[PDB]
């Protein structure tokens, strides 16, 4: 009765919705960009391979000075690497060896945790004892933590397994806003460059754009197949990526509500587990399920160079905020630095 | 060419990597478990020695179980955090006949998982007391649930438990092979099922996944030697 | 956005015949192996049958195995579930279900109580 007349409401407003975004597809990225030079054969080098994890990394982030970066591995440790020289700066052993994320602090004094623990563990990293202690434990989610990520040193939004974002007060340790709508598990985060915003990726072939402060969703961003496990924002705010099991990457514009553009080729069958853009965004790079990392011209949709040095399961990877490196974080306890 | 400071930093990160290398030592020391199961299984009474960790030993052998409980009922993704553990302590109510199929794709959809394609599974067919109760009660029938149990006799080269009705043989070994069939439909070997059937009271299944996990790195040393 | 629709329920008589159709659109249908889900009420959601992206590899759960047929269109995009002398014990809503990743031979969380790759479910009173 009420609820098939609400089912046929949500039908009329997806069709609208759906004609309203064939309406404003006049013309295809694609086409656009067909005049413009591709970027040719895109080869990067591994500089570093950074050693000393000894189980799959799941989650590395990049510092926001471009050398630091914190890596996640279920052996228990968060390791920070100084990239430049390949020295680990700390070891962070962690209550709960099943981490699945992992966030650098953009003030660089903390490092998040989380992952089966249902827990967002924030790391203290500039303490007068000079060790790295547990600063807070956020502990509200009902669900596994699958990404982090800071705003500030105080504020941090995190996804969940149990269908849902929040954005934590890490003072207080309280969820100030709580993201619900996604029907799936929210696999993969990526904040707005200014943060008014972020993105989530979740198991319901979906991705939703959030408002930080008022709370609620802005826009869902449909178009993949399968489970979005990999979402990252385009540099200018206004566009971001996705990664899914589909074998496909999708580009997303937040002003035109809809798919701009499918990165996937023929012989790709596997899964793509992290997405990442270049500096000017030009290069979408992502991480794959078949070890290896295609890098995207994200404007042509060409496939522009394989990052080929993983012997195992790509599961993270990270563009530096100078642009000068990307690494890659793979299920062979390996984290290859390439440019 | 190194600085004063620039060489220290390397030193404290040999100094974390000897911490790292002890710590994997002693992490290599233990297999890991990851104990599944439905509600009705019986997970928590398999070993009498939101993430439930059992850990026992046997033998000097360190055995770490996990049981992962904090999770709600969608599982694709927080499966994948078990690639590497030793075993997948499958538990499953033998007795129960109508969530028998739920069991049965459940293993299926771990024994071909992509991530989950390596691992061996300790298959516990749990509750065989009650198993034996149904069975010999004769108003549950296997084959209203399992309609190629009508048409199932047991093996002749088979070796019954001793004082064991053939009744409960037969359905012992029919929910066995169900598993066992599903087990060897694919993984070219590089994976096993080992069941066992348990009950509510049963001491032995420490030494059981103790035999298994033998097996488990016996078969790992066997692909190393090329001895399969 | 992938959507499943299923369709051609209804009301029937105990030993009579229904045919079920699941419209799918939103994903290569020829990629996934599709599934049949049913919910009995005061039951969870219990595998019915499902079949491979090619239509070879078909298997039923135990109840239902002499009795239906699942079939897939995969140049149409659907899926069908013929449902022959039907049982009052399969009176259910039947939800046309996806296994949620493409060239995959394990189906995880299509019983799940809120996985997003099954359809609003048609409703088979038998």
């Known amino acids: 009765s009420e609820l098939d007349q609400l089912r046929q409401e949500a039908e009329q407003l997806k069709n609208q919705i759906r004609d309203a975004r064939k309406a404003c597809a006049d013309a295809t990225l694609s086409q656009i960009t067909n005049n413009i030079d591709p970027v040719g054969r895109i080869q990067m080098r591994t500089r570093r391979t950074l050693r000393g994890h000894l189980a799959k990394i799941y989650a590395m982030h990049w510092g926001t000075d471009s050398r630091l970066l914190v890596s996640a591995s279920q052996d228990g440790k968060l390791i920070i690497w100084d990239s430049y020289t390949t020295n680990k700066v700390h070891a962070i052993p962690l209550r709960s060896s099943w981490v699945m994320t992992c966030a650098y602090a953009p003030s660089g004094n903390y490092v998040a945790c989380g992952g089966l623990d249902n827990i967002c563990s924030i790391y203290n990293l500039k303490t007068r004892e000079g060790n790295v202690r547990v600063s807070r434990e956020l502990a509200g989610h009902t669900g596994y933590l699958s990404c982090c990520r800071f705003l500030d040193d105080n504020q941090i939004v995190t996804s969940s397994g149990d269908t849902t974002c929040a954005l934590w007060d890490i003072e207080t340790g309280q969820q100030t806003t709580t993201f619900t709508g996604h029907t799936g598990d929210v696999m993969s985060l990526s904040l707005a460059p200014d943060t008014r915003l972020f993105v989530s990726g979740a198991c319901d072939a979906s991705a939703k754009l959030w408002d930080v402060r008022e709370g609620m969703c802005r826009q869902t961003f449909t178009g993949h197949e399968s489970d979005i496990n990999a979402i990252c924002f385009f540099p200018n705010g206004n566009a971001f990526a996705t990664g899914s099991d589909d074998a496909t990457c999708r580009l997303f514009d937040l002003r035109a509500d809809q798919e701009l553009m499918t990165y996937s080729h023929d012989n790709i069958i596997c899964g793509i587990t992290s997405v990442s853009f270049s500096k000017s965004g030009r290069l979408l790079l992502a991480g794959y399920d078949d070890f290896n990392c295609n890098v995207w011209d994200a404007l042509k949709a060409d496939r522009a160079g394989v990052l080929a040095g993983h012997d195992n399961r790509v599961s993270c990877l990270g563009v530096t905020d100078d642009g000068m490196a990307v690494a890659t974080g793979s299920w062979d306890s390996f984290l290859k630095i390439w440019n | 060419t190194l600085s004063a400071e620039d060489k220290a930093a390397v030193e404290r990160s040999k100094m974390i990597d000897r911490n790292l290398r002890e710590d994997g030592e002693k992490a290599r020391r233990t297999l890991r478990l990851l104990l599944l199961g439905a509600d009705n299984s019986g997970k928590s009474t398999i070993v009498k020695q939101g993430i439930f960790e059992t850990k026992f030993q046997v033998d000097k052998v360190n055995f770490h179980m996990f049981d992962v409980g904090g999770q709600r009922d969608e599982r694709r993704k927080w499966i994948q955090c078990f690639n590497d553990v030793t075993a997948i302590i499958f538990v499953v109510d033998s007795s129960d006949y109508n969530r028998l199929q739920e069991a049965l794709n459940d293993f299926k959809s771990i024994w071909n998982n992509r991530w989950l394609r390596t691992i061996s599974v300790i298959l516990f067919l749990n509750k065989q007391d009650l198993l034996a109760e149904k069975v010999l009660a004769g108003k549950s029938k296997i084959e209203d649930y399992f309609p190629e149990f009508a048409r199932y006799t047991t093996p002749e080269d088979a070796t019954p438990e001793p004082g064991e009705d053939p009744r409960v043989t037969r359905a012992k070994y029919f929910i066995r092979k169900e598993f066992v069939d599903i087990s060897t439909a694919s993984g070219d070997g590089r994976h096993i099922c080992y069941p066992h059937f348990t009950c509510a009271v049963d001491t032995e299944n420490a030494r059981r996944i103790f035999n298994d996990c033998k097996d488990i790195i016996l078969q790992m040393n066997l692909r190393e030697y090329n001895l399969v | 956005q992938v959507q499943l629709q299923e369709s051609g329920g209804g009301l029937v008589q105990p030993g009579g015949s229904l045919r079920l159709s699941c419209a799918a659109s939103?994903?290569?249908?020829?990629?996934?192996?599709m599934n049949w889900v049913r919910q009995a009420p005061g039951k969870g959601l219990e595998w019915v049958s499902d079949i491979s992206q090619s239509g070879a590899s078909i298997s039923y759960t135990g109840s239902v195995k002499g009795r239906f047929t699942i079939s897939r269109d995969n140049a149409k995009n659907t899926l069908y579930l013929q449902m022959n002398s039907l049982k009052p014990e399969d009176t259910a809503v039947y939800y046309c279900?996806?296994?949620?990743?493409?060239?995959?031979?394990?189906?995880?969380?299509?019983?799940?109580?809120?996985?997003?790759?099954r359809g609003q479910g048609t409703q088979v009173t038998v």
């Open positions: 279900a996806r296994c949620p990743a493409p060239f995959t031979r394990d189906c995880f969380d299509v019983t799940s109580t809120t996985y997003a790759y």
């Open positions: 939103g994903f290569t249908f020829s990629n996934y192996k």
